[PDB]
Amino acid sequence: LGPVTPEICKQDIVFDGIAQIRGEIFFFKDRFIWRTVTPRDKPMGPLLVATFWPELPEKIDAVYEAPQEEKAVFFAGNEYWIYSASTLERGYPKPLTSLGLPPDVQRVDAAFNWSKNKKTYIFAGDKFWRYNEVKKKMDPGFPKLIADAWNAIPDNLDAVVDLQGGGHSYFFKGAYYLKLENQSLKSVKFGSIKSDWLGC
Ligand SMILES: [Ca+2]
Ligand SMILES: [Cl-]
Ligand code: NA
Ligand SMILES: [Zn+2]
């Protein structure tokens, strides 16, 4: 007798964060992860996030992999953790203020590094920030409003990821994802997370 764990396809799971880390896609839900190497193939899981990142709290809010450093950055509450493989770095968790976020944002929604410009975007409610990974600082003139800067992208995102050299960013909210053409921000298509990411 084991405890009940979430069942993809049989339940409507809205993930906390999604990230491609070291060529693998991770879907995070509470203490668990499912992973796959290519999107429409049914992911292995649930594994426990603790067998890879033991220091992470029981729920993350957003995850991305900083491309250059190939470090995984996880947000949970008003802290973030940066790892190289399963090794937590020097002095993490740090408050979100060490990333350049204002002390008023107490949690973020979704985060990704966008291959279109290799800048990191951090989404929180109706706003986002663009973080410079080489200068290790936020770019000026942020936060901007998602409604003002993105095309057909909803506020309160769940997760965002840009896979590989695929040239699409994927915004996940509720049961659907929006697929953005990185070369044509005008062209946004929608699809179903269960059918297209979880291979249900
Ligand atoms: Ca989230
Ligand atoms: Cl995310
Ligand atoms: Na992400
Ligand atoms: Zn079942």
UniProtKB/Swiss-Prot annotation:
Query: What does the UniProt record report as the effect of altering S184I in this chain?
Result: In a colorectal cancer sample; somatic mutation
- Glycosylated residues (UniProt): N113, N182
Provide the coiled-coil residue spans. Answer: none
* UniProt-annotated stretches for the region Required for inhibitor TIMP2 binding: 1-200
* Binding positions (Ca(2+) 4): D16, D61, D109, D158
Which positions form S-S bridges?
C9-C200
Name the source's superkingdom.
Eukaryota
**Where are Hemopexin repeat segments found?**
12-56, 57-103, 105-153, 154-200
Q: What is this protein called?
A: PEX
Write down the species.
Homo sapiens
